[PDB]
């Protein structure tokens, strides 16, 4: 049925796109109301999410300030291990690299 | 290649691209090289509780005495919280030459009363070898049989020293039906035990269990009814064998066995449970039964 369903899918998307293009925006029958019923409903829903989105965007900068402190601390511990590893690379360069086998036997 | 190969493997596995593994009927595995006849024969008719074992970091098949002492001194210390531990490479429990040699872990108590007899094997598990680095000696299968307390102690020791982790391998009833089908498809003679399928219906108040034990030769003749392509058993052939069982049980007792789940499939080749206490190895097909079991352990690890 996979192919028998793909063919009907393309046949149905064709009908739906030919019917959406038939759908002119029908704003003529829009609403007999003065739309205060829909207005003061939509602002009230706005009041329902605006408190509900300030409560989320306040936690957003809460976690962003907490993470700014945390990642500043991480960056500090990273530049420390960066300068430390760089100075270890420079020091381990031509200090332990200048190691002879016979000199290692003489140290023994 | 060292990790990204495993990531691509994980992608392939999670993709679930047309899985039905047409499997070769477990071929008579003539005992390869050494395979200590006394040891292997002791290892056959023992009810191994399967586990999935992640690859062991920094393991070597030379330092067996050091690990033996390190674990013996740990087990008897868990008694402080009489026992000898003998790591023993099995030398032949491997599918291909490149697989890691299977090695044992036996809690020998005075005499050779082997309390626990652990067993890590990696046979035909080259879907894990080619994805893990050289430092890890990967043995996906772990085999307990000793008390669960000692297994949950040696597993902790292995986690502590090797960074290997034991998930208890649970063969789902799908894989259980698969192995129940390829084991009545084998070419054996003198069937040791009847082909029993311990079903367990999902009733909420009660827990009725069914033992659909077939005569082993009668199930072979029933398998030949649904066996058409030789050499390899398909998912449809396995399902038709299982549905011939269903249509011989719902025919008789009017209860749809297909609405139940397999919990144990005893066969002349090898018994196999679900909850872990799975692999009894009646016959010497254990390199094929273990091949399936390791392939299933890869599924859990990977």
């Amino acid at each position: 049925a996979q192919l028998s369903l793909l063919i009907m899918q393309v046949k149905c998307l064709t009908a739906e796109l030919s019917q959406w293009q038939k759908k002119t925006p029908e704003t003529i029958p829009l609403t007999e109301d003065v739309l205060i019923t829909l207005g003061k409903e939509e602002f009230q829903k706005l009041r329902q999410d605006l408190e509900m989105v300030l409560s989320t965007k306040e936690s957003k900068n809460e976690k962003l300030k907490e993470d700014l402190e945390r990642e500043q601390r991480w960056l500090d511990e990273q530049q420390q291990i960066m300068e430390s590893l760089n100075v270890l690379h420079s020091e381990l360069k031509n200090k332990v690299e200048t190691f002879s086998e016979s000199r290692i036997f003489n140290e023994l | 290649t060292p990790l990204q190969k495993r990531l691509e493997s994980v992608r392939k596995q999670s993709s679930f691209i047309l899985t039905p593994p047409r499997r070769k009927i477990p071929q008579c595995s003539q005992l390869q090289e050494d395979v200590d006849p006394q040891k292997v024969a002791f290892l056959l008719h023992k009810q191994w509780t399967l586990y999935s074992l992640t690859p062991l970091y920094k393991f070597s098949y030379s330092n067996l005495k050091e690990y033996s002492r390190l674990l013996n001194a740990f087990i008897v210390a868990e008694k402080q919280k009489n026992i000898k531990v003998i790591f023993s490479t099995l030398l032949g429990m491997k599918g291909t030459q490149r697989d890691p040699e299977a090695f044992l872990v036996q809690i020998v108590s005075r005499e050779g009363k082997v309390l626990w007899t652990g067993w890590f094997c990696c046979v035909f598990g080259d879907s894990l070898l080619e994805t893990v680095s050289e430092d890890f000696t990967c043995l996906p299968l772990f085999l307990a049989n000793g008390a669960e307390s000692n297994t949950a102690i040696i597993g902790t020791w292995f986690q502590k020293t090797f960074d290997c982790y034991f998930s208890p391998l649970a063969i789902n009833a799908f894989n259980l039906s698969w192995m129940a089908a390829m084991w009545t498809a084998c070419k054996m003679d003198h069937y040791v035990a009847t082909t029993e399928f311990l079903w367990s219906v999902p009733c909420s108040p009660q827990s009725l269990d069914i033992s659909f034990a077939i005569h082993p030769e009668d199930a072979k003749a029933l398998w030949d009814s649904v066996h058409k392509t030789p050499g390899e058993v398909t998912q449809e052939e396995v399902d038709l064998f299982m549905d011939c069982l269903y249509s011989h049980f719902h025919r008789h007792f009017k209860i749809h066995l297909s609405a139940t789940r397999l919990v144990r499939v005893s066969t002349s080749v090898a018994s196999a449970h679900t909850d872990g206490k799975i692999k009894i190895l009646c016959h010497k097909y254990l390199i094929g039964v273990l091949a399936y079991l390791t392939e299933l352990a890869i599924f859990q690890i990977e």
Partner: protein
């Protein structure tokens, strides 16, 4: 037992002595996490992958027996995983491997806060090998769950966008096109995700706020990450927030498109984008700059054109400031 001392009687004098001196396997190790952060070595990222896979499997099978009390250590362990990835900054290769395994089985709210922060740290794969495996399920639950899970995905994919664009910025630093096509397709698929989520919830302002929060990080691709990936709005969000009904979403869109103007101008300096992207942005401009109105009407009711401006502007409309100055 464990350093339980008996010098407490002496610790009258010894507490005076303290006052006298005053006067006269690796996740729970932050000091060691820096090591694994710096070694992308084979036997350690694999010694660690196998622990994470078998901890996110065993302790997640632990859900199937409690699902209530085990749902607090798993949450607090996934929090440690999340923190370790935020520090170490690459997605653990068991974090995705557990996600593809446990996303299809996943519900909407079972450790949502942790699972949808794991998605953020997913090793950029192709968006052709990660889309069917994961994003085809972060749409299977995106379109069936409530707004409170919907906003938690375009936020999850918002952070995923940054965690992919970081690893692409230094892919410019450490010396593209086929990597380019991946973030572009991720953003379009979110841009496909975020036009139909706009339709499920009847243009809910909360959800489109998070949509723009995602797009607040799509305007600044060139300026921030040095990536030439200016991807404009799909109109199903652009005009849906243009003709929206609040300004905390209107000025949000205005900030995004101003950063879009800035990023396109910056891309014109260094250099398809030009033809169709500039056409679409001039479409989003002429239509909107002629349109720059309902939430502004709310302000005007609460309220000489320049004075109206000042009343605006002064009252927090900063995205409008950045546009109007541009």
């Amino acid at each position: 037992i464990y350093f339980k001392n008996s010098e407490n009687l002496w610790k009258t004098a010894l507490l005076a002595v303290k006052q006298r001196n005053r006067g006269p396997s690796v996740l729970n190790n932050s000091l060691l996490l820096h090591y694994i952060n710096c070694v992308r070595d084979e036997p350690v990222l694999l010694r660690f992958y196998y622990w994470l896979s078998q901890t996110l499997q065993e302790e997640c099978i632990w859900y199937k027996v409690n699902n209530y009390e085990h749902g607090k250590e798993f949450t607090n362990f996934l929090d440690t995983i999340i923190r370790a990835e935020c520090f170490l900054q690459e997605g653990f290769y068991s974090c995705e491997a557990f996600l593809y395994k446990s996303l299809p089985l996943w519900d909407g709210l079972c450790c949502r806060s942790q699972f949808l922060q794991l998605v953020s740290w997913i090793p950029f794969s192709s968006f052709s090998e990660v889309k069917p495996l994961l994003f085809d399920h972060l749409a299977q639950l995106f379109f069936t769950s409530t707004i409170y899970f919907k906003c938690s995905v375009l936020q999850s994919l918002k952070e995923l966008l940054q965690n992919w664009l970081l690893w692409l910025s230094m892919d410019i630093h450490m010396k593209l096109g086929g990597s380019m096509n991946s973030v572009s397709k991720l953003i379009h698929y979110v841009g496909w995700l975020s036009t139909t989520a706009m339709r499920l919830e009847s243009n809910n302002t909360f959800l489109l706020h998070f949509i723009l929060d995602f797009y607040e990080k799509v305007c600044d691709i060139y300026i921030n990450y040095n990536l030439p990936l200016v991807v404009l709005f799909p109109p199903g969000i652009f005009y849906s927030a243009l003709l929206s009904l609040d300004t905390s979403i209107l000025n949000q869109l205005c900030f995004i498109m101003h950063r879009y103007r800035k990023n396109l101008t910056a891309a014109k300096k260094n250099e398809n984008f030009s033809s169709k992207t500039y056409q679409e942005f001039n479409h989003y401009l002429t239509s909107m700059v002629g349109c720059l109105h309902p939430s502004f009407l709310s302000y005007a009711v609460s309220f000489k054109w320049s004075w109206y401006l000042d009343y605006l502007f002064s009252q927090g409309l900063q995205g409008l400031k950045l546009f109007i100055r541009s």
